[PDB]
Amino acid sequence: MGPSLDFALSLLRRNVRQVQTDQGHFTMLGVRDRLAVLPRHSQPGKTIWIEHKLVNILDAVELVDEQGVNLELTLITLDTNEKFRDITKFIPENISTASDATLVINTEHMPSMFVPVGDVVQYGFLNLSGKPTHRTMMYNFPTKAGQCGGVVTSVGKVIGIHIGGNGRQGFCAGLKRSYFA
Ligand SMILES: *[C@H](O)[C@H](C[C@@H]1CCNC1=O)NC(=O)[C@H](Cc1ccccc1)NC(=O)OCC(C)C
């Protein structure tokens, strides 16, 4: 087995979780410790289904940019026994683009799904379903629903959380390492 398959499979193994909320199925990225991240619109409550059990959520923090605008990411802190593997190092310090990116989706309905989204490029601003959102990025792939949360990865870097699509294009909320400190 080669480099990027091993990395993307290691994430599937250790960090990417199948979850469910009143809104439906999403892919959760567990980043370190008891800290996970989901799309904002996933609308996590006081509890969240994580694969085989309902997990208590202690804290939920919806992220806004300096101008108080939506980033589309919620940092959830979980009442879970054991720490997530630390992958903060894999996350760039500032939002980065990539070439030949891979969308990693893990969901009850689409488990361990690998989607070749291609080059990822700055989009900057997206409006989805009425909410104005910053620090987004774009890939030219027809991304379907139930693929939100999916993890954008290139070459051992973890660069976005999927949040949107128009049927010809996908957009993710880019990841910054400061978010998870
Ligand atoms: C999340 O599951 C879903 C995935 C979309 C649907 C088809 N392809 C995709 O990539 N995303 C959405 O439904 C978002 C909802 C949203 C996003 C940000 C803030 C609030 C709500 N909306 C969406 O894709 O709207 C269509 C736009 C005109 C591009």
Layout of helices and strands:
Blueprint: H1 3-14, E1 16-21, E2 24-32, E3 35-39, E4 47-50, E5 53-64, E6 70-79, E7 98-105, E8 113-128, E9 131-139, E10 151-154, E11 157-165, E12 170-174
Antiparallel strand pairs: 1-2, 1-4, 2-3, 3-6, 4-5, 5-6, 7-8, 7-10, 8-9, 9-12, 10-11, 11-12
Bound molecules: the ligand *[C@H](O)[C@H](C[C@@H]1CCNC1=O)NC(=O)[C@H](Cc1ccccc1)NC(=O)OCC(C)C.
Protein name: Genome polyprotein
Domain Peptidase C3: 2-180
Subcellular location: Host cytoplasmic vesicle membrane; Host nucleus; Virion
Provide an overview of this structure.
It is classed as hydrolase/hydrolase inhibitor. Keywords: hydrolase, cysteine proteinase, inhibitor, hydrolase-hydrolase inhibitor complex. It forms a monomeric assembly. The entry is titled "Crystal structure of EV71 3C Proteinase in complex with Compound 2". The protein: 3C proteinase. The longest helix is centred in the first third of the chain and has 12 residues, at 3-14. This protein starts with a helix and ends in a 7-residue tail after the last strand. A six-stranded antiparallel β-barrel has the order 1-2-3-6-5-4. It contains one helix and twelve strands, in the order αββββββββββββ. The protein has two domains: 1-15 and 85-181, Trypsin-like serine proteases (Thrombin, subunit H), CATH 2.40.10; 16-84, Beta Barrel (Thrombin, subunit H). With 181 residues, the chain is mainly beta. Bound molecules: the ligand *[C@H](O)[C@H](C[C@@H]1CCNC1=O)NC(=O)[C@H](Cc1ccccc1)NC(=O)OCC(C)C.
